[PDB]
Ligand binder design. Structure first.
Ligand code: MG
Ligand code: MG
Ligand code: MG
Ligand code: MG
Ligand code: MG
Ligand code: MG
Ligand code: MG
Ligand code: MG
Ligand code: MG
Ligand code: MG
Ligand code: MG
Ligand code: MG
Ligand code: MG
Ligand code: MG
Ligand code: MG
Ligand code: MG
Ligand code: MG
Ligand code: MG
Ligand code: MG
Ligand code: MG
Ligand code: MG
Ligand code: MG
Ligand code: MG
Ligand code: MG
Ligand code: MG
Ligand code: MG
Ligand code: MG
Ligand code: MG
Ligand code: MG
Ligand code: MG
Ligand code: MG
Ligand code: MG
Ligand code: MG
Ligand code: MG
Ligand code: MG
Ligand code: MG
Ligand code: MG
Ligand code: MG
Ligand code: MG
Ligand code: MG
Ligand code: MG
Ligand code: MG
Ligand code: MG
Ligand code: MG
Ligand code: MG
Ligand code: MG
Ligand code: MG
Lengths: 95, 97
RNA sequence: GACUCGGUGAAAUUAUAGUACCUGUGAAGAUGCAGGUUACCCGCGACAGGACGGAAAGACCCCGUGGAGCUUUACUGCAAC
RNA sequence: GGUUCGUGGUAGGAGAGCGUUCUAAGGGCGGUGAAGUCAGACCGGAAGGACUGGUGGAGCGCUUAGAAGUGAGAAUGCCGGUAUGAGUAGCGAAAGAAGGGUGAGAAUCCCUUCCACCGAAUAUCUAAGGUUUCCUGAGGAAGGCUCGUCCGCUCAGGGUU
RNA sequence: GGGUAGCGGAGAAAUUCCAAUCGAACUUGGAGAUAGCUGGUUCUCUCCGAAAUAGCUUUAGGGCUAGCCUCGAGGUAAAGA
RNA sequence: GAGCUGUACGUAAGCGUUGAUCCAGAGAUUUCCGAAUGGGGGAACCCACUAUCUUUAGUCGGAUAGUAUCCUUACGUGAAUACAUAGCGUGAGGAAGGCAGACCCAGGGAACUGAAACAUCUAAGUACCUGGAGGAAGAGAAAGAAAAAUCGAUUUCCUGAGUAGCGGCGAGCGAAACGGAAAGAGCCCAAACCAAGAAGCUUGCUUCUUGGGGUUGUAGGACACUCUAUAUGGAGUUACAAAAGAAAGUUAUAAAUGAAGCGGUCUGGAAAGGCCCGCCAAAGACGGUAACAGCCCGGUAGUUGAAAUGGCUUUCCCUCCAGAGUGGAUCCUGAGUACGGCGGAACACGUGAAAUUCCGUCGGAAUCCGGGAGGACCAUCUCCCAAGGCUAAAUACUCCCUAGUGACCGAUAGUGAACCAGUACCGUGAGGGAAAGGUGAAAAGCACCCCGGAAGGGGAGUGAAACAGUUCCUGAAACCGUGUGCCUACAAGUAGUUAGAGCCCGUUAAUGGGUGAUAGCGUGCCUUUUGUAGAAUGAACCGGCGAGUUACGAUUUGUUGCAAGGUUAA
């Protein structure tokens, strides 16, 4: 996938378009990605072992990768990604 | 089938035989020899090139249907007595090959 | 057992039905057609005259140039001897 | 364009058409709501076609042509669903009673007492066959011809030296 | 616990039994057997519109040719009524 | 190159940039059953023996290997029987079984059916069984086809031709050659004879073994003669002899890189859509993404790529190799064969006038002055040389793999099977054989409150929607209900239709809609029939599904093109 955990992305489609964030998890089997403060859902949680008081929890739900563009840390702009081989390991490049 | 009435074909007799050595000739009536230019001798191979006969079965026979105008020197495998009497009548020589 | 009550709950059948009687009529035996005669609406227990009731494409009978099993001095065969 | 004679119809011949799915080309509709579906008092000589509104939530017309798994009311048709009969037949040989308990709930589970039945069996073993039905705890959707707290049923754990 | 198997077994003999099948088991295939028989065969309007006879037929509820219908075309002292 | 520990709408413990999970090549491990093979057995079990270790104080235990049968072959031993031989033992090889129900060759081989019956005939050498099996098989380098005065192995396609023919001359069956194409490729033996052995007494001559030689028609070979080659050249594992290896190239099996819009607005839950602007394009394939994207993602065109394994192609190595002419004194040139009789079968050809080919049985040539065929047969002529073998390609089929395509299906369709299906279930067994797809973009899968034992519900909340609430897109009809506008308890009803008050409504607004006191008229639908309301048939109802099709020929009409010409097939 063109983004991985820890990357800053821009959201380009959906109810949260224009909002940027830090990829918290990646689910490459589903081509989905979890972004901090994006696609916030209200989980109606019974009390259990984790969250013992229960409650209506406001937390992040995954966005399809095709809906995020990588933030070039140089210009702070969304970009497409290239791949250049720098001696040892290949590294992502911007446009 | 006639519903059990003996079928027509079985009421009437078989006739004759097929000759193994039967010779069918390609026919060239005179009227089509007017296609050629006076003085010309007319062979089989010439009648092929002109496309008056495509297949020459057994050979070329000339028959007397219509009438000829040009003094040809026709040579074919056979001739109608009448055809031979009509080519000469105009002023041409028939020879058999 | 039936019947009433409480529980549970099938089936064959079924063109749609507000589904009388008589005499006639008609594919010649009509709940349904005609002319009459009777008959307020809805059920329950009973009975089987009718619905040519249900069941099973009649076993009888005939037909089919349909089968099958059996017979023989039918025809043609085959084993065996 | 008009006169004249026609226009009942089974088997059947002839003709012109409607609609369905698909293709091509052209031209369109559609999240400001496609197909489908429901409703209506609209239009055409028929097959049929629109329009409007609801439902629906993503595809679909029209024109010309082409190609066909192209149109159903009947086949004791096939498959599915649902009626009718009907709260009807039946609930599969048999003796139960009360008290106490349990429980949301008890003719139907547990206990007690009395009663009744089998007793050359309806008792006790064992082989076949079955294959976990055995035991304990929990359960009561379905199964049990009713009920059910119960069970040869469901769920866990066990159990055969 | 074994044996005999379908053109076959078995039969104190009935056409009796051979897995709720037996005048020849079951299953799969040949196989969409064949069926001059029965049933069924789906949209519309327009024009015309029969026959249920003859002859022959192992034919008689089948078929063929002819007759009677329809569509097209032709010639035609119009020959038809 | 950052996540991962399969599904599947779980808990736990963990792993990973010191490179995991994942993808491809190679390797290792691979219980037990199964041909199953140490013996047995009711498959997936039981029980051994022989070695060699191992454990125990020793039994009792453990590990590793070997141990089936037949065939061929070598070596040993070895009966009646004296030598032998059978038999027995050991060691090498080999087989066994399975299946792609296809295709192919062979052995065996129906019947229904058609013939309007049926027996010859057909169906049909089909189905089926059995064997062989190969990637193809079969056929195949003329004792051929013919009748120019000539072809040159086989196979397949077009054509010949529904002809010639066969046929209770019925039903039907039905060629071939010529011509045109695809593809092409030719070869090795047996025998004369030569050499060298062995075995024999044929006692110096015959019969077997190995090598050389040699392959064909008025001839070829042997054999004499001569001319050049003795690897100069040539050929090869696809026949023509048979094993071997290397190297380079290429293809396959993982991948890499890869242009251009977060453009502005509108609607919207969301934009890829509308409107308005740009841009890339050897890339406007396909898919996904919250609606329809060439410019968001995976990609796509183009361009790169392989440590490993396999395939193919070249080249090298390696292995292997004699060809012309001239003479016909003599010799050789496939024998229980060819042919023939008898009985069958195959040939399109049913015994026919029946050539040709094969089987069983019996008889049985010639053998270079020789032999066969040309559809009885003879003569002439022509063409050919059997009784030995091998041989690629063009052809057939598809259990499979890779890439794709479809005026093919879209959940009763399409496979029986979109779903844990040859399952469940049925059957003693062979065998028969289903039903069953869709929450949402995302679980955001309904905290909390309330009635209830629970189920279920009502709120609250999530969501665009919950009348999307874990079998959850849409949600028709039958069928079941609740409500109520009109009618209905003196009526005889195929249920409507025409006339028609009254009452209630108000539309796609037009000589409208609902209901219907009362009056007239009125015997469902279908099938089958001379005739059916029929007391004849069929249908409980609703829904889906459910019947003149295609191929190749014939004929006729219409259309179009060309026209005494028209048209190509493979
Ligand atoms: Mg004659
Ligand atoms: Mg009751
Ligand atoms: Mg009356
Ligand atoms: Mg009674
Ligand atoms: Mg009756
Ligand atoms: Mg009957
Ligand atoms: Mg009239
Ligand atoms: Mg009419
Ligand atoms: Mg559609
Ligand atoms: Mg249809
Ligand atoms: Mg129906
Ligand atoms: Mg009753
Ligand atoms: Mg009663
Ligand atoms: Mg009762
Ligand atoms: Mg009881
Ligand atoms: Mg007793
Ligand atoms: Mg118990
Ligand atoms: Mg119960
Ligand atoms: Mg219990
Ligand atoms: Mg008797
Ligand atoms: Mg029995
Ligand atoms: Mg058949
Ligand atoms: Mg049938
Ligand atoms: Mg008329
Ligand atoms: Mg007769
Ligand atoms: Mg063993
Ligand atoms: Mg017949
Ligand atoms: Mg890109
Ligand atoms: Mg918006
Ligand atoms: Mg949508
Ligand atoms: Mg989409
Ligand atoms: Mg001969
Ligand atoms: Mg013979
Ligand atoms: Mg024959
Ligand atoms: Mg001869
Ligand atoms: Mg013989
Ligand atoms: Mg001859
Ligand atoms: Mg002949
Ligand atoms: Mg020879
Ligand atoms: Mg299906
Ligand atoms: Mg559906
Ligand atoms: Mg639904
Ligand atoms: Mg009165
Ligand atoms: Mg009244
Ligand atoms: Mg009646
Ligand atoms: Mg009925
Ligand atoms: Mg035609």
């Amino acid at each position: 996938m063109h983004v991985k955990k820890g990357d800053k992305v821009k959201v380009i489609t959906g109810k949260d378009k224009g909002k940027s964030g830090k990829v918290l998890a990646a689910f490459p089997k589903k081509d989905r990605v979890l972004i901090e403060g994006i696609n916030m859902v209200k989980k109606h949680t019974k009390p259990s072992n984790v969250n013992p008081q229960g409650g209506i929890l406001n937390v992040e739900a995954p966005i399809h990768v095709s809906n995020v563009m990588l933030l070039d840390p140089k210009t702070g702009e969304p970009t497409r990604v290239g791949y250049e081989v720098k001696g040892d390991k290949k590294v992502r490049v911007a446009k | 089938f006639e519903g059990g009435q003996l079928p027509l074909f079985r009421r009437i007799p078989k006739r004759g035989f097929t000759n193994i050595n039967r010779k069918e000739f390609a026919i060239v009536n005179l009227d089509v020899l007017n296609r050629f230019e006076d003085g010309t001798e007319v062979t089989p191979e010439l009648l092929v090139e002109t496309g008056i006969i495509r297949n020459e079965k057994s050979g070329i026979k000339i028959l007397s249907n219509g009438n000829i105008e040009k003094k040809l020197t026709v040579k074919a495998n056979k001739f109608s007595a009448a055809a031979k009497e009509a080519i000469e009548a105009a002023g041409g020589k028939t020879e058999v090959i």
